[PDB]
Design a protein around this ligand. Structure first.
Ligand SMILES: *[C@@H]1O[C@H](CO)[C@@H](O)[C@H](O)[C@H]1NC(C)=O
Length: 92
């Protein structure tokens, strides 16, 4: 069943509303799991689709040096390559 989940925020960009959107969404199977910096609601039958949402972040620090913001974990099947997938915050 759907187990892997990892997404963090940009460096000092601290989250305020992500708690709200964590609490909000609940679709046919639910755990309300949350690890105090993350969000964990994935469990379901075999699912191959994706969905959409919107989340932004609160500002703790003025500056951002040019070093991109990709938080990538990747583990989906033993045989194929485990399939990294990246794109930077072009604000840099
Ligand atoms: C998703 O992929 C699997 C691969 O075996 C397939 O069996 C299944 O019919 C597909 N559809 C869903 C959403 O389960």
């Amino acid at each position: 069943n759907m187990a892997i989940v990892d997404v963090k925020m940009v460096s000092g960009f601290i989250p305020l509303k992500p708690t709200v959107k964590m609490l909000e969404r609940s679709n046919h199977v639910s755990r309300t799991e949350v690890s105090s910096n993350h969000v964990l609601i994935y469990l379901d039958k075999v699912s191959n689709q994706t969905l959409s949402l919107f989340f932004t972040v609160l500002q703790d620090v003025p500056v951002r040096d040019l070093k991109p913001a990709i938080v990538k974990v990747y583990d989906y099947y033993e045989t194929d390559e485990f399939a990294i997938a990246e794109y930077n915050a072009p604000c840099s």
